[PDB]
Design a protein around this nucleic acid. Structure first.
Lengths: 147, 69, 121, 247, 362, 236
RNA sequence: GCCAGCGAAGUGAGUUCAAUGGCUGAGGUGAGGUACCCCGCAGGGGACCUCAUAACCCAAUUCAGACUACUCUCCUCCGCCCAUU
């Protein structure tokens, strides 16, 4: 009496960070549902639209969580490399990148986001080498121990 | 991390590779002590008694902090 | 010369599926072509299965202009994907059309005789 | 194995109605049925003399199969939206017993449940036009498969707009994950003289819907036989059929 | 689940056998004589511009076959019909244009086994002992009854014969359109026109299409290699795809344009100047093919310029039982066919085509 | 379990080249090699010091996966049209022994036969763009899989043209019917600083090419590992 | 008739916006076939090839028991009718 879902993560890795400020659930739902109709036809455009919805999106961070079924996860996860030219008021060229295809199970999908976030700030220490930013890392470590 | 006299040859190996691995500020402090070791030996003979030898072995306490960089 | 015997039983060795093509139009202005029928096949699969399945390996064989009969073939992955796309009348200009299939067999030797009527009286 | 049944929704003139009979007789269709669209706005039910099959047809249908005449039957499809209109449909059990197979078109989840459990119909129309979302619940489906109720999953997306191709494949795949595919039939409502396909090609549009690897051929032959036979037990009686024979 | 069945497979099978005509344990005669229904008979000979007059008289004398409109089933079980055609030869019957998965289909065997395929609306009304044929899930829709007429001929007053004869006359009338033919293997010769004088019988001749194809690109073959040696010979699988295009007038080259035809010839090949085409379209007796098979076996008595000849016989798409046991259905196509690639050293290739729901004998 | 070993075709400037290295280090890539376009038009031989990546890059490739440094290789892509240009490859094999993995681009099926049998290369470039007539034959494929020779499929359909999308998917499936997937790699060229895809994104892009249900993940991991393993004994 | 509980890490599945019965290949058993081999009692075994392996249904703390929904199957007990001697 219940449906088995699949949850796939994405990451926008690009320069010119004004594109990361122009993110919205109305734009993202009009982007993914359109590019399936551009790569595939009207079959996958509606077979991946009866369970497709957005749940988690941070424009300042850049993590995209999408919904899809057990029977139709291979159409959304294959349409991800063909997403270019996010048309807006300016000139923007983003491109999604998967991290790990999680089979349902939101809890360990958020657990993989924690271990991905912890490995990003440790590499950022020596490469940036900023005194004002290193104090902001110490604010991130101290508040994480209070959790 | 703990370890005895054979183990501290490789217990020091997992600690130093964690510094290049985890890449963050992790302070390493070690503490040595003495671990007593009682050996028992007894053959299957009526006229014999188990002579319990005394022996000690070296240990370490390699302590890894989480130092804010 | 020699004399021997060999028993080899293959299980799906073909990897191809041939189709007899029949077309029906309303108006008598059949301005089609062998190059234009190939364009009608690509744009029809693009509307249902998309651009990836639009370039499946398919070719036109013994195409005729008056009878409008041809032979197409796609592999075992694309036999289902061609029946579906041409069902919904993928017309060229905008005038309504129909696509009706006479016979389907994976070999031209089984396709050449008949399967539909099987005797014409 | 009665093969290649249809459910046509077209009446305006005898020139277009006879053309659909000769076209269906050409490809594979042995039994062709005609629906009658009845809406809730007009509240009109022309039941008395609607078609006159024996009077308004030229006496000889010819198919390329067994060269048997077409069993031309008259069916009924009622667009139902309000519960204050289904009471007239529940009053047809004793007033006017015509239209051998009766199909219903629900629009409300409170009205879809009574049509599959309480209301005595033969098939249920599920078509989605112009952004009509509808949830498919499992208790009204699991009773209908044992009762004998089938579903007219009527497809006609290639008439006007290509956006209607999405709403046919979306509502069908919502059904196939839930109904499991026990008795679901497919047919095309054709108003133009070329909107009908051969029944050997129809069986892949049900396999485009999925539904089986093999029962998609039986969704037009076997499940259409059990859906036509449900209208025969509703017409005369459920246990005893008394026929007058005069040689 | 839903994406697997859109691209996986239909069921198809091919059995390839090489053998010798001179072998004492060869079944090249038994597999053709016990194959019951034949519609398309086509044979090819490369480099043959002048046909031999003995083979030309054999093509025109394959039939004839008769067609009777609205013939009931109780006529075929009378003792007059059994003693005329069945007891003094082999009579064949096939209900024309009644598909195997749509309506009732009745077939007759030369051994006297009236094997008929009925649906659920007829198998329950006739009351004849049968068994299911193909499972369609749970609702079994087709049944096949085997009625041996030769065992009923010993005791005509038995309880088995009166159960069947009453089931067709007054219990269930069933008329059909039969494709009737008979092989003359009896002392007293009586034609079929004299017996069926009441119904509308029509004598039909097989359609003969004689053609000659020029500039054909034939592959290179080795009879002692079925899988095909690299860059020397070809695979026997590759010829079975090539052979249908020659009969369907498909012999083209590479054309890089908007209409690219990706049909390449199986390599290595040999440019052959002439190729003789024939198509014998009609209800073909298998005994006439046995005189055709032995004539093609005797075609290489003289040193010919052709390395190998072709004998390909395509059956119906409506045959209930072929190969003595195989119940041929119809699942979105699928036809039964066999092939002979006869070489000069009395060796032949046996390529049997198996449809969707069908089995294969040795 | 060495994963995500692909190759790039990239030289215009040091700013655009290092941007592709830092992007590939971000996603999943632990082996990134730079290809060089050599054709019959200019006929240049820059083998000794083409880029010198280790003398220009700032000594720290860091990935966010296994957190290991990147083994940066140097590979060569030779565009061969005429058989007179193919004899140049047999002359430079003993003069300058660099470019550890050698990839060649054939155009003629007569030259494709000697490339799979006689010519000593490691990978075979197969790119069909804008109506390039080249058909595949089964005996030259069956020798190259027993030899250990690999086949490339370089794609960039998503940004430049939509007409080029069809020739990359149609010419691929002409190879999938014959090669069966014994040693097939799928790399991507990148001229713009964002023309690369993720590490697990190739695993469905190989399934988008068909070819497998599970071994398409091995087309970026296992078959890419055999390029350096077979090319190391060729250099020594 | 009435009276007794413990917030503390981690279920030979342990999910909780609710993971998991996968594919291919080779077998078992149940039908069908042999121009194949061995044992020599007309017989039997092996080898090879084709096909069926499901329906009912879904873990949410666990276990025992009753009840109910079932057939690719095996065991026990029988009925009806057909045909044979």
């Amino acid at each position: 009496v219940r449906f088995k879902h699949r949850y796939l993560l994405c990451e926008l890795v690009s320069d010119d960070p004004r594109c990361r400020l122009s993110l919205d659930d109305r734009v993202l739902s009009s982007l993914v549902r359109d590019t399936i109709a551009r790569v595939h036809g009207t079959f996958g455009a509606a077979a991946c639209s009866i369970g497709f919805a957005v749940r988690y999106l941070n424009a300042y961070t850049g993590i995209v969580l999408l919904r899809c079924r057990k029977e139709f996860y291979q159409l959304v996860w294959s349409a991800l490399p063909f997403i270019t030219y996010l048309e807006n008021k300016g000139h923007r060229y983003p491109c999604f990148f998967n991290t790990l295809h999680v089979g349902g199970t939101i809890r360990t999908c958020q657990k993989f986001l924690i271990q991905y976030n912890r490995r990003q700030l440790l590499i950022l220490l020596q490469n940036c080498t900023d005194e004002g930013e290193r104090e902001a890392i110490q604010k991130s470590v101290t508040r994480s121990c209070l959790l | 991390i703990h370890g005895l006299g054979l183990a501290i040859n490789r217990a020091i190996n997992i600690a130093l590779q964690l510094q290049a691995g985890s890449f963050g500020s992790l302070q390493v402090a070690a503490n040595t002590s003495t671990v007593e070791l009682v050996d028992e030996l007894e053959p299957e003979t009526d006229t014999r008694e188990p002579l319990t030898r005394i022996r000690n072995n070296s240990a370490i306490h390699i302590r890894v902090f989480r130092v804010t960089p | 010369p020699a004399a021997t015997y060999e028993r080899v039983v293959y299980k799906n060795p073909s990897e191809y599926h041939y189709m007899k093509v029949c077309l029906e139009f309303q108006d008598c202005g059949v301005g089609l072509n062998a190059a234009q029928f190939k364009q009608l096949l690509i744009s029809a699969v693009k509307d249902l299965f998309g651009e990836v399945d639009a370039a499946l390996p398919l070719d036109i064989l013994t195409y005729e202009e008056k009878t409008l009969s041809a032979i197409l073939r796609i592999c075992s992955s694309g036999l289902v994907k061609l029946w579906s796309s041409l069902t919904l009348l993928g017309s060229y200009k905008g005038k309504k059309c129909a696509f009706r299939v006479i016979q389907v067999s994976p070999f031209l030797l089984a396709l050449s005789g008949n399967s539909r009527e099987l005797v014409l009286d | 194995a009665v093969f290649a049944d249809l459910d046509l929704r077209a009446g305006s003139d005898l020139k277009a109605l006879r053309g659909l009979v000769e076209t269906a007789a050409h490809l594979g269709y042995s039994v062709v049925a005609i629906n009658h669209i009845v809406d809730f706005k007009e509240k009109k039910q022309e039941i008395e003399k609607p078609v006159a099959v024996s009077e308004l047809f030229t006496t000889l249908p010819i198919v390329q199969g067994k060269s048997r005449p077409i069993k031309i039957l008259t069916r009924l499809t009622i667009i139902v939206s309000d519960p204050s209109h289904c009471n007239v449909l529940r009053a047809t059990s004793s007033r006017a017993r015509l239209y051998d197979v009766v199909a219903v078109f629900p629009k409300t989840e409170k009205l879809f449940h009574i049509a599959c459990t309480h209301l005595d119909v033969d098939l249920v129309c599920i078509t989605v036009t112009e952004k009509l979302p509808f949830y498919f619940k499992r208790p009204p489906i699991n009773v209908a498969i044992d009762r004998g109720l089938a579903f007219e999953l009527v497809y006609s997306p290639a008439i006007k707009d290509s956006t209607m191709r999405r709403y046919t494949i979306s509502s069908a795949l919502n059904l196939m994950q839930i109904c499991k595919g026990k008795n679901v039939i497919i047919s095309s409502a054709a108003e133009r003289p070329l909107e009908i396909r051969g029944p050997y090609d129809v069986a892949n549009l049900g396999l485009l819907f999925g539904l089986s690897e093999s029962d998609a051929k039986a969704a037009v032959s076997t499940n259409c036989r059990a859906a036509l036979l449900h209208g025969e037990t509703r017409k005369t009686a459920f246990g005893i059929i008394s026929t007058v024979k005069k040689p | 689940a839903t994406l697997r069945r859109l691209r996986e497979a239909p069921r198809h099978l091919l059995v390839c056998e090489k053998s010798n005509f001179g072998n004492h344990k060869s079944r090249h005669r038994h597999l053709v004589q016990t194959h019951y229904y034949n519609y398309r008979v086509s044979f090819l000979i490369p480099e043959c511009g002048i046909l031999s007059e003995e083979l030309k008289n054999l093509v025109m004398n394959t039939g004839p076959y008769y067609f009777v409109k609205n013939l009931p089933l109780h006529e075929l079980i009378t003792p007059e019909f059994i003693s005329t055609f069945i007891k003094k030869g082999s009579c064949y019957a096939l209900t024309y244009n009644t598909h195997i998965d749509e309506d009732n289909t009745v077939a007759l065997l030369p051994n006297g086994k009236l094997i008929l395929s009925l649906d659920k609306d007829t198998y329950e009304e006739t009351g004849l002992q049968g068994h299911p044929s193909q499972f369609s899930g749970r609702k079994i829709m087709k049944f096949i009854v085997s009625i041996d007429l030769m065992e009923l001929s010993l005791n005509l007053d038995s309880k088995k014969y009166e159960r069947i004869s009453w089931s067709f006359k007054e219990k269930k009338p069933l008329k059909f359109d039969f494709l009737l033919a008979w092989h003359k293997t009896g002392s007293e010769e009586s034609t079929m026109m004299s017996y069926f004088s009441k119904y509308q019988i029509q004598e039909h001749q097989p359609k003969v299409a004689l053609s000659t194809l020029r500039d054909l690109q034939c592959p290179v073959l080795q009879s002692s290699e079925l899988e095909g040696t690299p860059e020397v010979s070809c695979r026997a699988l590759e010829l079975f795809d090539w052979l249908g295009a020659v009969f369907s007038n498909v012999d083209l080259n590479n054309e890089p344009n908007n209409f690219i035809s990706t049909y390449c010839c199986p390599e290595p090949s040999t440019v052959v100047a002439k190729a003789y085409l024939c198509t014998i379209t009609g209800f073909i007796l298998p005994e006439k093919i046995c005189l055709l098979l032995e004539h093609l076996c005797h075609y290489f008595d003289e040193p010919k310029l052709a390395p190998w000849v072709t004998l390909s016989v395509q059956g119906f798409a409506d045959s209930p039982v072929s190969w003595e046991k195989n119940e041929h259905g119809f699942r979105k196509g699928g036809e039964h066919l066999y092939n002979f690639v006869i070489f000069n050293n009395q060796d032949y290739w046996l390529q049997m085509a198996v449809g969707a729901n069908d089995h294969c004998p040795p």
